[PDB]
Amino acid sequence: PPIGPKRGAKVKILRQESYWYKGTGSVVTVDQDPNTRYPVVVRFNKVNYANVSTNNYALDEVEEVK
Amino acid sequence: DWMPGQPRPSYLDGSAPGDFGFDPLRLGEVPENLERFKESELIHCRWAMLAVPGILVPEALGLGNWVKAQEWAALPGGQATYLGNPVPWGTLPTILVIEFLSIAFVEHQRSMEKDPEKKKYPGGAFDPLGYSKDPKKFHEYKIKEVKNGRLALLAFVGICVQQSAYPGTGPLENLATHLADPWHNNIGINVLIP
Amino acid sequence: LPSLFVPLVGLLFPAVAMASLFLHVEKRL
Amino acid sequence: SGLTPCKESKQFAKREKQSIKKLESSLKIYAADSAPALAINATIEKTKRRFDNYAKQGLLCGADGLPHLIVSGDQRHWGEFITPGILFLYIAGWIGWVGRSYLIAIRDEKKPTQKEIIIDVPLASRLVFRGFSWPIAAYRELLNGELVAK
Amino acid sequence: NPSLVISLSTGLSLFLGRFVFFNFQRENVAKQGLPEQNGVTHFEAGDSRAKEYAGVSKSAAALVDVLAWGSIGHIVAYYILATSSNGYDPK
Amino acid sequence: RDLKTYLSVAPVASTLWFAALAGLLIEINRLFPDALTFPFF
Amino acid sequence: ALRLPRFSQGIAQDPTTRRIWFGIATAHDFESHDDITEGRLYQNIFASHFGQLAIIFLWTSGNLFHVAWQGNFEAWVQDPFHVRPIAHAIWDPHFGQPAVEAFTRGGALGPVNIAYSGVYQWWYTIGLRTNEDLYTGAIFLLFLSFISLLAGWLHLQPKWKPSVSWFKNAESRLNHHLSGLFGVSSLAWAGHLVHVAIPGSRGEYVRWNNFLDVLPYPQGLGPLLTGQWNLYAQNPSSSNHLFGTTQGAGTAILTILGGFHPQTQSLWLTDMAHHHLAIAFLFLIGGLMYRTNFGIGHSIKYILEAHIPPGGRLGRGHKGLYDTINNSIHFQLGLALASLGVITSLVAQHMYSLPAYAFIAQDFTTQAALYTHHQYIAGFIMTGAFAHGPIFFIRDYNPEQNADNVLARMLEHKEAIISHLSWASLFLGFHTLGLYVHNDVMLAFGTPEKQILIEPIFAQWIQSAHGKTSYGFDVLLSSTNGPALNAGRNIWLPGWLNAINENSNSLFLTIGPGDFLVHHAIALGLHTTTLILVKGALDARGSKLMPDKKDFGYSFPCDGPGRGGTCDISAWDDFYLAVFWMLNTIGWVTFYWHWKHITLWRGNVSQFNESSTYLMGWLRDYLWLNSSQLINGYTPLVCNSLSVWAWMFLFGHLVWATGFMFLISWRGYWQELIETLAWAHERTPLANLIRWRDKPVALSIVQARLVGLVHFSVGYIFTYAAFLIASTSGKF
Amino acid sequence: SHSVKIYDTCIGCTQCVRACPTDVLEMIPWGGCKAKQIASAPRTEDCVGCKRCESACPTDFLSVRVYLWHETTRSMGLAY
Numbered sequence A: 001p002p003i004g005p006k007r008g009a010k011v012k013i014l015r016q017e018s019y020w021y022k023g024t025g026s027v028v029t030v031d032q033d034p035n036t037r038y039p040v041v042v043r044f045n046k047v048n049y050a051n052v053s054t055n056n057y058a059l060d061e062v063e064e065v066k
Numbered sequence B: 001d002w003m004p005g006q007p008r009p010s011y012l013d014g015s016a017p018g019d020f021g022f023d024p025l026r027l028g029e030v031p032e033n034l035e036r037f038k039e040s041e042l043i044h045c046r047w048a049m050l051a052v053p054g055i056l057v058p059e060a061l062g063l064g065n066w067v068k069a070q071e072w073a074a075l076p077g078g079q080a081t082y083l084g085n086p087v088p089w090g091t092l093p094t095i096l097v098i099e100f101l102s103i104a105f106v107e108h109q110r111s112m113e114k115d116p117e118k119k120k121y122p123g124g125a126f127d128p129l130g131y132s133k134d135p136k137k138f139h140e141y142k143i144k145e146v147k148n149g150r151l152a153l154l155a156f157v158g159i160c161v162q163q164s165a166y167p168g169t170g171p172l173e174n175l176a177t178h179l180a181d182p183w184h185n186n187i188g189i190n191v192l193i194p
Numbered sequence C: 001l002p003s004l005f006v007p008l009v010g011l012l013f014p015a016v017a018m019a020s021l022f023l024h025v026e027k028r029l
Numbered sequence D: 001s002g003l004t005p006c007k008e009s010k011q012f013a014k015r016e017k018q019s020i021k022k023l024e025s026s027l028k029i030y031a032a033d034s035a036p037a038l039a040i041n042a043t044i045e046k047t048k049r050r051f052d053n054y055a056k057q058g059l060l061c062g063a064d065g066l067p068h069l070i071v072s073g074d075q076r077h078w079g080e081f082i083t084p085g086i087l088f089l090y091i092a093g094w095i096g097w098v099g100r101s102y103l104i105a106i107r108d109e110k111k112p113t114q115k116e117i118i119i120d121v122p123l124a125s126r127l128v129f130r131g132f133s134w135p136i137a138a139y140r141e142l143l144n145g146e147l148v149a150k
Numbered sequence E: 001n002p003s004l005v006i007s008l009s010t011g012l013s014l015f016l017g018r019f020v021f022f023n024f025q026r027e028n029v030a031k032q033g034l035p036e037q038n039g040v041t042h043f044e045a046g047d048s049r050a051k052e053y054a055g056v057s058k059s060a061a062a063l064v065d066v067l068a069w070g071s072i073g074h075i076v077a078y079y080i081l082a083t084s085s086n087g088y089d090p091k
Numbered sequence F: 001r002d003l004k005t006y007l008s009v010a011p012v013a014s015t016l017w018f019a020a021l022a023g024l025l026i027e028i029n030r031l032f033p034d035a036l037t038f039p040f041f
Numbered sequence G: 001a002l003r004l005p006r007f008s009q010g011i012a013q014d015p016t017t018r019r020i021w022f023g024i025a026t027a028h029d030f031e032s033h034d035d036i037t038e039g040r041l042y043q044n045i046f047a048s049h050f051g052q053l054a055i056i057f058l059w060t061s062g063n064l065f066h067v068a069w070q071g072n073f074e075a076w077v078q079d080p081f082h083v084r085p086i087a088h089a090i091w092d093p094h095f096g097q098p099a100v101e102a103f104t105r106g107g108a109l110g111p112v113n114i115a116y117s118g119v120y121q122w123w124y125t126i127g128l129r130t131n132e133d134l135y136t137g138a139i140f141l142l143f144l145s146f147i148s149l150l151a152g153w154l155h156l157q158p159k160w161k162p163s164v165s166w167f168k169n170a171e172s173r174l175n176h177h178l179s180g181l182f183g184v185s186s187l188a189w190a191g192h193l194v195h196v197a198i199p200g201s202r203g204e205y206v207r208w209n210n211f212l213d214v215l216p217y218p219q220g221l222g223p224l225l226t227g228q229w230n231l232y233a234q235n236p237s238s239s240n241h242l243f244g245t246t247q248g249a250g251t252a253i254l255t256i257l258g259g260f261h262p263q264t265q266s267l268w269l270t271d272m273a274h275h276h277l278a279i280a281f282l283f284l285i286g287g288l289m290y291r292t293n294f295g296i297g298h299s300i301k302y303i304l305e306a307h308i309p310p311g312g313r314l315g316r317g318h319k320g321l322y323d324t325i326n327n328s329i330h331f332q333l334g335l336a337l338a339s340l341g342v343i344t345s346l347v348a349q350h351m352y353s354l355p356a357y358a359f360i361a362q363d364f365t366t367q368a369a370l371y372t373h374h375q376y377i378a379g380f381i382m383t384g385a386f387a388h389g390p391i392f393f394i395r396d397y398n399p400e401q402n403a404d405n406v407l408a409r410m411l412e413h414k415e416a417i418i419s420h421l422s423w424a425s426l427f428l429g430f431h432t433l434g435l436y437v438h439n440d441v442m443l444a445f446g447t448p449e450k451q452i453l454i455e456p457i458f459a460q461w462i463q464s465a466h467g468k469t470s471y472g473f474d475v476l477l478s479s480t481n482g483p484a485l486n487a488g489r490n491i492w493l494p495g496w497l498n499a500i501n502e503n504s505n506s507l508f509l510t511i512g513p514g515d516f517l518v519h520h521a522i523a524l525g526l527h528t529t530t531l532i533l534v535k536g537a538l539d540a541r542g543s544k545l546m547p548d549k550k551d552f553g554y555s556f557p558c559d560g561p562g563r564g565g566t567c568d569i570s571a572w573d574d575f576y577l578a579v580f581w582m583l584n585t586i587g588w589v590t591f592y593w594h595w596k597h598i599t600l601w602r603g604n605v606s607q608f609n610e611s612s613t614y615l616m617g618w619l620r621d622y623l624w625l626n627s628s629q630l631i632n633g634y635t636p637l638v639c640n641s642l643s644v645w646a647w648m649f650l651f652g653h654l655v656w657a658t659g660f661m662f663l664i665s666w667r668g669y670w671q672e673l674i675e676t677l678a679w680a681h682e683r684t685p686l687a688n689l690i691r692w693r694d695k696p697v698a699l700s701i702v703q704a705r706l707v708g709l710v711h712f713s714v715g716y717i718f719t720y721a722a723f724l725i726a727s728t729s730g731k732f
Numbered sequence H: 001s002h003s004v005k006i007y008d009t010c011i012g013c014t015q016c017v018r019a020c021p022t023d024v025l026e027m028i029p030w031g032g033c034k035a036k037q038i039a040s041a042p043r044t045e046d047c048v049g050c051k052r053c054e055s056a057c058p059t060d061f062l063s064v065r066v067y068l069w070h071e072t073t074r075s076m077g078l079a080y
């Protein structure tokens, strides 16, 4: 089947070291490629210290939230 | 529900004796703790059942006050008395030692129990009449005990509170004071101002 | 007048100390 | 309350007396019918009124001769602290509650920061009087007061 | 009051220890166990319990027990001796 | 001009707000000076 | 190794001058040294501890030697009220003729310094009377200082070094420190008092030559073992008693009179002998709680494991917390410093109010000096306590082994702790400053009646509860129908009530609205300094700006200009920030103390009570006013004996401002400057014959903040000390 | 010299390598991301520690880190 969380779905970050740690964001796409350590690119409404609004995460680093 | 329309907490299914599903703080969520509590309520109650009469009856006679009896202890020599007679064992050090030694032993004895402190219903030499022979009958009695025990604890309190404010303590007396003019003599006067 | 221990503490000890530290510090084993 | 009421304090009277003499002294150079004179006489009348009110409102005074405030909660001095305070907390609560009503109205929108640097005055004027009943924030607290995520 | 008071208190205390509170106190000691840093404490430490000195022929009590109860005994007793002569007076 | 209204409500909104507040406070004082307490109850 | 510092290879390979600088500031950080083991760690510390004790014993030995050799003491004993104690002699060839004249005081033969540490009153009270006593005492400490070095050297030898598990035997050490180090020491101190100190205050000299065939008491130890101890309080010293003499002398050795000896204005010697004897009991019995080798006692671990509130509102409570502390020396130092910092302030606040040394209260400069002394020591100790706390979190804290216990939950809700400390600081700051400024405007507009002067009735109510007659109130011990009063009736109360209601002493001084404001300043100082320190501790292991602040250690310069910029983001750096605030806090405390007291000694508590409510008053009537005799130490017309304090006063200002350079200007500027000087030296004839062995570089980023802070602190301490002593001693 | 590490969190943007003033990093083939490349610190002896690399990383958390270590002439940026 398709690999990760749906595209529309919003997720909760589990990185700990991420700026948007216990917060949420929406997934843009999921790299379908195995070997790729961190796919699941996500974007956030608010910018981080480095002025960027998107980052990639591991599969176990995100929880679908509703 | 014994708060009329309030859901009963999960643990209390109303099977316990004296179980009216009252535990706004849920100090009984823990089973180990609650069991301890059931034991304590009874203990506290048993004393209370004893204390009110202890406090109330002598006053009907020459007690004057539960407070008054304690009065001698403060001054040297006491000697204190039970019924107009000093001693035996009149002085405070002797009583203190006798009490501490006699008591500690009895209670600690309790602190050697399993099977729920014999279910806080030991029934050994204690149930000579063996009221507990019948299980159905035994249960009814427990309810009587708890309700009665609770009634007693509540009363003790009032005595202390009443005793407070009215250092001219007269638990039995106050009642009179209430009786005389119940309308202008009530706690109300005590809850407010001169 | 023993108060002539002052220069010793005041100057001699410091000079010796400094020279020694300086040497230990610049040493290359 | 180791103090003495101001009405019956000598030091409190000496201050009113000394102050008026200082202003009256200045009164001398300007002569009578004059602008400064009327200005000084107005300060003198404002001075008398001040001390008069303090005594009138039962404020204790200290050996210094100056009123001191009781904030213990004593009933005779609620005017000193408690009454004005409640007044404050009402206003402070008002401002904060209205300010928080604006951010929530703004939050789900376009560029939310755009209305934080350029105020939506129609929206603000709509929300300002909601602070009048802000202590019914309590009833929001019974449900949606603060976020559960944290 | 005489020196006799010391004896009764110490005697009673000892009595209390040997026949009343004795079973319970041990129960607690077993549960508490000895101190352990990461586990046991004898492992370095040079110093460890003295099993022999601890052991006694009486059916239950040991010398160390004697020391403690006696001490409480003496202390409680001396406590009563002093409060007597103070002749402290309160309202 | 929509836009002019837009220049306004910027931090000019702060000054118009505080100037109004300052005025109100000043008049209150002019009316009720030297108040160390609330004496109406 | 190869060269200094050879506890660190990587720092010795530094070709710059930084190797020397950093070689000195890391000499005691044993854990960061090369090839360090847990064994060598505990052994180095243990040895350092003996070295420290050796210095302490040696230091006091010096004071004793010099007081005996260059100080009067004996002259001071005859006239305590009218003789200035001498610190030591002054031998300075730089001294001009006037300076030698101006400084020869106290009836000395040459120029001398006047002691303000109060060792004279201490040793007189203690029993010491002549110089011979002081010398043998100095010898004894010189001896103790030797056996300290000797013991430190001994346990560094392989056959006497203690194992690490020996150091981790907590219950044994506690059983001995409570029972022996605290108890027996205190017990034996009361012994000195009833043998030497108390009889010495009654004219009879009891030294080593005659303390055997001489009784401390007529009944002589009979009643103690009898049980009738009350006999030792049968005949106390009279109210007309004179210290050092038999006029009014009693026989009692253990009392509880309370209050002060009328002549000396200090606590009764018979009150203090009793005090330490009673202390030694709770300590002696107290040091038998934990388990050793006799089958009785407590397992400290097992207690902590057992203290978990059901309903898990504290999670797993204190489980695993035993090893968390016993394995981490920083956690232990943190606990030690915090506890020690509190009782250091406790000492300060009790020795000015309840003097224990004969004739110490009359010496106002000494009283001012000692109070300020300890409050700064306490302050510094407190920041250190909050420094090793962070260090612990970084170096020793094990997250998995502290899973869900009270320590972990701290980090778990750290944002909540920090934000509220921020609120408390903001609340106190906005209003304390607010009220001060409001009052200054009123004084400016010439209307002091418009001030906001809040009466501190809560604290006034406390003083009343203690028995102070002022304010009225009719509280406990201030009311005739009080169970608390009649209970202590005619024991310690007559002495206490008399002392608390004496208008001379500093026993619970009268407080007013001016006292209200400064206390909130004090409250502000405490909350902010704590806010800084605990924000530092709880963020030591990371934040959102720097998730991995661990891995980088306690002290690092920064994390660069990226992510917005990260200067002063290390836990070491908020320590650095907090010291400023702690200096500000203690400054407010000592300003408060010293102004209240000089006005009291001057008989003018009015000036304090009316000027401490507005800040101009502090500047004008405290600082500007009392600076008069100080800044006139030397003059275009003359020099005084206060000249040294005038010089030090500027010295303090100089060091203070010099530190501003290191704190305001940062490194890149100086590095580029030095490299232009590197060019100069090489291109200068006759000078380039001489080459540097260490490459000249700018001080590092952290080093700058350290050097800057030290200057700021040294200036701070030396400036106020110059003012405190001069303004006081100039007037007395 | 200083210590510089890279993490599989790297996306192969290559910006740090472009940011470095002393040629410490370089890119090497990899298969953990769509760019198929990852940074490397084969010459940490020439690093100065200015962190221009870190200042240029777009990973949520830096994928390139610089741990300032023992100081050498090279790291101290000395022309003398």
Ligand code: CLA
Pocket (backbone or CB within 6 Å): C006, C007, C009, C010, C011, C012, C015, G093, G094
């Ligand atoms: C405790 C340390 C200490 C001591 C004991 C001295 C002592 C002295 N200083 Mg120095 N000084 C010091 C610290 C000290 N100072 C510090 C920290 C500073 C920096 C602020 C100075 C700055 C300073 C200045 C600017 C001057 C002095 C001068 C003097 C002399 C003034 C007395 C005089 O005129 O008699 C006698 C005057 C003489 C010239 C006699 C000369 C002494 C003979 C030549 C000694 C022989 C040389 C000696 C053996 C070599 C040292 C060897 C040793 C390092 C191993 C006196 C010897 C004054 C001075 O020396 O005059 C030129 C002077 O100008 N001092």
Ligand code: CLA
Pocket (backbone or CB within 6 Å): G024, G025, G026, G027, G028, G029, G030, G333, G380, G381, G382, G383, G384, G385, G387, G391, G554, G555, G572, G575, G710, G714
């Ligand atoms: C029981 C007391 C105690 C002990 C044993 C320690 C022990 C330690 N500390 Mg702690 N500390 C303490 C109290 C203590 N501290 C207090 C009270 C504070 C608050 C001021 C601190 C604040 C502190 C910080 C910020 C740090 C430590 C660090 C350390 C560790 C390294 C020490 C070192 O080698 O540097 C050697 C120290 C020196 C060579 C001293 C030079 C600098 C001093 C301050 C200047 C001297 C003052 C000045 C010259 C006075 C003369 C002026 C003149 C005009 C009269 C070591 C474990 C460091 C650490 O965590 O390890 C990485 C660390 O950075 N401490």
Ligand code: CLA
Pocket (backbone or CB within 6 Å): G421, G422, G423, G425, G426, G427, G428, G429, G430, G433, G528, G531, G532, G577, G578, G580, G581
């Ligand atoms: C006198 C100089 C000064 C002042 C006023 C402050 C003030 C403050 N410090 Mg700083 N600090 C200082 C020196 C100073 N510090 C120095 C030299 C250092 C060493 C680097 C530090 C290091 C330091 C640290 C590490 C921290 C602070 C914190 C704070 C805040 C503490 C909370 C508080 O008081 O709330 C009240 C606010 C004030 C007292 C300042 C408000 C000023 C006025 C009254 C505001 C009103 C403006 C008015 C309308 C006029 C407007 C002018 C117009 C042009 C707009 C407060 C803002 C702590 C903090 O951030 O708190 C959470 C914090 O952690 N300080």
Ligand SMILES: CC1=C(/C=C/C(C)=C/C=C/C(C)=C/C=C/C=C(C)/C=C/C=C(C)/C=C/C2=C(C)CCCC2(C)C)C(C)(C)CCC1
Pocket (backbone or CB within 6 Å): G330, G331, G333, G334, G335, G338, G339, G342, G385, G386, G388, G389, G390, G392, G534, G537
């Ligand atoms: C009886 C009495 C009393 C009492 C009181 C009390 C109860 C007390 C207290 C007290 C207290 C309550 C105190 C406290 C404190 C504290 C502090 C000062 C702190 C600290 C700290 C620190 C510094 C820490 C650190 C750390 C960290 C941060 C991390 C981890 C580790 C550690 C822990 C190290 C009164 C007065 C009422 C009355 C009279 C008598």
Ligand code: SF4
Pocket (backbone or CB within 6 Å): H004, H019, H020, H021, H022, H023, H024, H025, H046, H047, H048, H049, H050, H051, H052, H053, H054, H066
């Ligand atoms: S730090 Fe500066 S030098 Fe070292 S690698 Fe990153 S960029 Fe190159």
Ligand SMILES: [Ca+2]
Pocket (backbone or CB within 6 Å): G499, G500, G501, G502, G503, G504, G505, G506, G507, G508, G509
């Ligand atoms: Ca006093």
